[PDB]
Design a binder for this molecule. Sequence first.
Ligand SMILES: CCCCCCCC/C=C/CCCCCCCC(=O)OC[C@H](O)CO
Ligand SMILES: CCCCCCCC/C=C/CCCCCCCC(=O)OC[C@H](O)CO
Ligand SMILES: CCCCCCCC/C=C\CCCCCCCC(=O)OC[C@H](O)CO
Ligand SMILES: CCCCCCCC/C=C\CCCCCCCC(=O)OC[C@H](O)CO
Ligand SMILES: *C(=O)CCCCCCCCCCCCCCC
Ligand SMILES: *C(=O)CCCCCCCCCCCCCCC
Ligand SMILES: *C(=O)CCCCCCCCCCCCCCC
Ligand SMILES: *C(=O)CCCCCCCCCCCCCCC
Ligand SMILES: [Ca+2]
Lengths: 148, 148, 147, 151, 175, 182, 181, 183
Amino acid sequence: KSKPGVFSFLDPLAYEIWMCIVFAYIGVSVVLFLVSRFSPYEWHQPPNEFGIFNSLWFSLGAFMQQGCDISPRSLSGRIVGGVWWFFTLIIISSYTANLAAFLTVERTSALSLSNVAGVFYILVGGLGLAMLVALIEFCYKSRAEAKR
Amino acid sequence: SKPGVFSFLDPLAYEIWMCIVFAYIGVSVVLFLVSRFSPYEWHQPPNEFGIFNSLWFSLGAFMQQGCDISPRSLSGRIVGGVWWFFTLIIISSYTANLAAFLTVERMKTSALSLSNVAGVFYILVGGLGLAMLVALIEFCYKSRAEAK
Amino acid sequence: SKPGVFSFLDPLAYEIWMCIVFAYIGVSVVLFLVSRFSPYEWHQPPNEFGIFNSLWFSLGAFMQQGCDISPRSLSGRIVGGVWWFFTLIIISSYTANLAAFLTVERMVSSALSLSNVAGVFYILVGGLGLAMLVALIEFCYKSRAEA
Amino acid sequence: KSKPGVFSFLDPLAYEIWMCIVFAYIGVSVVLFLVSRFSPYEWHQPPNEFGIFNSLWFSLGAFMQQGCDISPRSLSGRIVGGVWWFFTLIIISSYTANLAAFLTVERMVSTSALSLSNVAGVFYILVGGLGLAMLVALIEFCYKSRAEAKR
Amino acid sequence: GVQMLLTIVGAFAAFSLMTIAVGTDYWLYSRGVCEVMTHSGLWRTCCLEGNFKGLCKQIDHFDTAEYFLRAVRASSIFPILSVILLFMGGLCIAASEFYKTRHNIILSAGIFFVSAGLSNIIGIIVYISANAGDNSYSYGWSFYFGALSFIIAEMVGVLAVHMFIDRHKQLRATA
Amino acid sequence: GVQMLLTIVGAFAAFSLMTIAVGTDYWLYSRGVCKTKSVSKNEEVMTHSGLWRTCCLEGNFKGLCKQIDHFPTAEYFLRAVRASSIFPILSVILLFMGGLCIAASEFYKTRHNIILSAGIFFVSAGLSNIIGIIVYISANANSYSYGWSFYFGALSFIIAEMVGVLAVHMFIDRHKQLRATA
Amino acid sequence: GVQMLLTIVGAFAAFSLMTIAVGTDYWLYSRGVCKTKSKKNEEVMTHSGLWRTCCLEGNFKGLCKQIDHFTAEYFLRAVRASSIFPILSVILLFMGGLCIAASEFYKTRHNIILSAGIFFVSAGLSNIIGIIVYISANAGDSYSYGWSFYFGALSFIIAEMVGVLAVHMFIDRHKQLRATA
Amino acid sequence: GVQMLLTIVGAFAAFSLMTIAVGTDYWLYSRGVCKTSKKNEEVMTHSGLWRTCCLEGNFKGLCKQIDHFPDTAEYFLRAVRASSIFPILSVILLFMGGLCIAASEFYKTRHNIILSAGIFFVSAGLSNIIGIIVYISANAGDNSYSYGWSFYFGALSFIIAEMVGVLAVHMFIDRHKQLRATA
Ligand SMILES: CCCCCCCC/C=C/CCCCCCCC(=O)OC[C@H](O)CO
Ligand SMILES: CCCCCCCC/C=C/CCCCCCCC(=O)OC[C@H](O)CO
Ligand SMILES: CCCCCCCC/C=C\CCCCCCCC(=O)OC[C@H](O)CO
Ligand SMILES: CCCCCCCC/C=C\CCCCCCCC(=O)OC[C@H](O)CO
Ligand SMILES: *C(=O)CCCCCCCCCCCCCCC
Ligand SMILES: *C(=O)CCCCCCCCCCCCCCC
Ligand SMILES: *C(=O)CCCCCCCCCCCCCCC
Ligand SMILES: *C(=O)CCCCCCCCCCCCCCC
Ligand SMILES: [Ca+2]
């Protein structure tokens, strides 16, 4: 008997592989930002939409295997995009492949809600944070407007 | 030895499908809300994220596919960012568990057959029937009503 | 014991591989029909899903590759949704049955070799020579016509 | 100890496949370039954006499943993206499905989470690629700067 | 108005459904004892079959993670928080009539409804993670009632935000 | 024109290839028995089978055909859907009604809504065929092989869907001319 | 300007934290020996660092030894021993700080700011490799990381953020210039 | 021009490296018998495409002839790695592409000769891949095996052939753009 835990969907990859995916996401994003908009020559209105906040969203959609609305169009920027799509690939495969090893050999019934009950919390929590972030801006933008 | 029509849903338990469908409605009534509740962004809408273009984006994300629209606000990227994770964890579980269901043939390894995934076609061909029944009622309406 | 050339098509049975081409042909004809049959939608085509851009959407959808056109009608947004679920279950059933083939072949009582994926490479170099044939032929025609 | 290698993430596929993916990616990127832009009847200004560079990028993106922005619009250029999306599909499925055969069979010998050591080689390449991007970008800034200074 | 009407009705429906759910003892149809089949609930377990038929009994709700989940379920905050937030959405819709000028009341209603649904979807994930934590079980009408409150709450929530979006819209037009 | 020729040829070919398939019994080359009521040994011979009968092919008892024992609650539905062959038979009906639409389209002209009927019928006929193939394959499931009869339905599918796009294209072109006169 | 203050403050923090991390002995909490090679052998809870290990309990409490660190196997072992990356991070952050210091006394030289940006970003990148090399080797040769490990981990974030901020100042310099004409 | 000089050099380079590859006998470094009564052989041998010669042993340099026919459908492979038409078709194509380039610098105006070269180089590189795959997929059928410089010349030849193909297309495009400019 070993009851499933809440945040057990993070078992396949160890702790030092979830911390270093955060240190690499903040590294790719900053580097993408820099290589794209540091050059004064390319400027002029920016040459590319890869600002800092749009470089943190491109690097997130890449890791989550989803698509974004921007693809780097420079050599510098396309190297960052390519070494990060390769990283992403090896790590998303190593999670599905390790998870499979965890479910095949128990050291096989339908996967239970408890097994993933943790992802669903982060979802609701994110949705809750989302609404806060939105209504705070609204509140601020509301008073500051009447105050004019 | 007697597989079911909808046996493609066995990896995940029933409650993990009753809650992938409650999370999909949630993450859509939040994306829409945070994207359009504000009156200080309107002028023509701010973004293409009504209550129908939101229910698509979410059904685009969960299917690992992509949609031309992508959240552009902080309040909208949080939502879109936590639903791109609640997808990666699930779409992987479903695979990594299906590999367990096929390795240990609990009651050598044969090929998958049409009867194992028969449902995956009874549904498709049912959505092509519904799609044509929704397209024609429009044409049947838009025609008679206008002709009048 | 050496694997066959077209061995990468063995996790799924012939019957599935043949029913995946009948579904592809039947999702693209349905995608096109609902997208453009209505004359109340034309005002210049309403969308871009012709007979050819719908065969590209379906193919792009299946190979887990983001398409460059998404359906925006209600009817067309259903054909696309039942073809994203089909794709999902089918692609997650090749990878999950291939991992069952590869596993039970080990514990019998090793990495993949080119012998295992010889076929994909051939097919690839056969579609690159078919593209250059379908492109140089058109070029000949358009040039002979200008004469 | 059995300390796993640095570049061990590439075990699932043999060394031949890897070398043959690089060879089947250079070919797909040349043939795409050709079938799209060689015919001048299409030009009016380039008819497609699939220049050799934008083809080496579509083919790369395609392989990593990561979608892009450009997409072939001709019959020719679509037989080069359709056989490459199918190739890509089988190869990525055969990497995940063989990495999941190793990790399992090893779990039947007589915790188990992957450790940084297992996939430490995918971090070195990354931080290395990051630094080459910051070198390719400065040798361009430097270059362009010297020109502006002389003139 | 048609939209204002399909909100009051939907709100009262959602509130009614939830209030029934949270208290009707028919959430789970499993086999226990108040061993005979029983129609469990959110607070009481009653012997559905055999002798002592219809006798009820308060549920026995008892790492620190295990304790935590046990408590949040034993107290049923989330199903009851959803019962609270739906009521506030109802009040805001009613008060929205008294004050046509102030449009922040409908948006408050909108947030309440949407957030109330999120309190259900969390009360359906702590009630399933714990009934299994301690088969032939089957879920019942009281349960589905709860689930149906969610759907109606998100839908009413969309209607409320659309009313807001439209109210502010007309203000813009005049200008 | 040229369009209606391809459509009329295609529509007829899809009907022919889907009436032969239903009406013939070379669907599956399995290995079974075609006899029944065995007197008081067990011997299964190669028998090409179809939708209605099993017919021997080797040894003695050659030619001898025997109505397939269809019924020998999920499986109850499958047997009923496979014992009646509605889907294969629905396809002939639709492909016929689609033919009626293309015929009528000549006499009752300026009624474009009859070409759309034709196109929809042909597309719906292909969809019926897919289900009737899945049902067939699922139901019947040693070595087995598929015969010509099977490859006629599977061919009647493509031809029909292609006639479907042509009939939709004709409907589009018809309405476009109307948007061009004005 | 407020941006320069945050940059200066952030530069200081990122540098102070990393130097503390490289100069303290609280990188890991593992079970081991604190006594020297030379008996009454006994495994004791030890708080090891990047350079020296230290006994946490027992009669040798606080006695600190030198980690006897000792072909691709040897390469990583050599890199980890010398720890070039955790010190090259310190070095780059210091060099980045001088550029910010130099900026005030050379307002017409915009490049001097870009250098701080690149230095800071490169400093963060070296720190990641230091972390990876540390752990990867730490496993080749039960345990929990101490504060020094999280000081260098926090130093990464600050350096990247200050590098982003420094890049934005560079753009603003050139942006103003362009506007003049 | 500069774009032409590289094409001539690249055509020559690709053709030279593939002809050397098809001829030299250092494709594979495996363990095998370098001679046609038990024989204590199993000495380190280097094999090409038709000859196998051991690197060490009492037969320091003795060579032999590979036997590629030692039941159906698969045979087709044994017969495509025995004629080695794909490596040889790649040599022929590269030679033909050079003729085109050379003929181009003489006739001129033709423009379609420069394209032909582009099709004869890209296809040459494509025949090469098939030959590489067939080579590897045949040895596997029959394990310290290592690859020699004749394999890496045929791999390097592929790269140079594709690059000359890009370059030849880039010249064809430029010729036609010059025409459109005068128009
Ligand atoms: C500009 C348009 C084109 C942009 C192009 C961007 C390139 C990004 C690189 C992608 C993957 C890199 C993979 C690196 C694999 C390294 C393998 C390795 O180091 O292997 C060592 C050893 O040989 C093992 O045996
Ligand atoms: C503007 C650019 C985008 C910014 C916004 C991006 C989306 C926000 C969420 C990110 C990842 C999803 C949530 C990751 C949660 C990880 C697990 C967690 O919260 O912690 C687990 C716990 O530590 C176990 O003990
Ligand atoms: C955005 C607006 C348009 C959206 C269009 C969405 C189309 C449907 C998509 C996916 C659902 C596919 C599966 C639906 C049916 C699954 C449930 C089912 O049939 O389950 C049977 C089972 O036996 C019960 O016990
Ligand atoms: C709009 C244009 C879209 C793009 C159009 C081109 C895309 C082609 C994609 C996949 C080809 C797959 C080919 C599969 C070949 C299978 C070979 C086969 O049948 O093998 C039988 C086997 O050998 C018996 O043992
Ligand atoms: C202006 O500052 C007012 C802001 C009001 C914010 C109200 C709270 C935001 C949404 C929280 C949603 C929580 C959902 C989950 C409940 C269990
Ligand atoms: C206007 O009133 C139109 C009414 C007719 C709608 C017809 C809808 C198409 C049906 C398609 C059926 C698909 C499945 C076929 C096999 C059963
Ligand atoms: C006009 O008629 C010219 C086109 C007709 C000849 C096309 C010849 C080239 C065909 C494509 C290239 C095939 C390469 C195969 C490599 C193994
Ligand atoms: C002009 O002089 C251009 C040449 C100078 C290039 C300097 C590149 C510095 C950034 C790249 C090196 C990163 C080091 C850390 C990587 C882990
Ligand atoms: Ca798997």
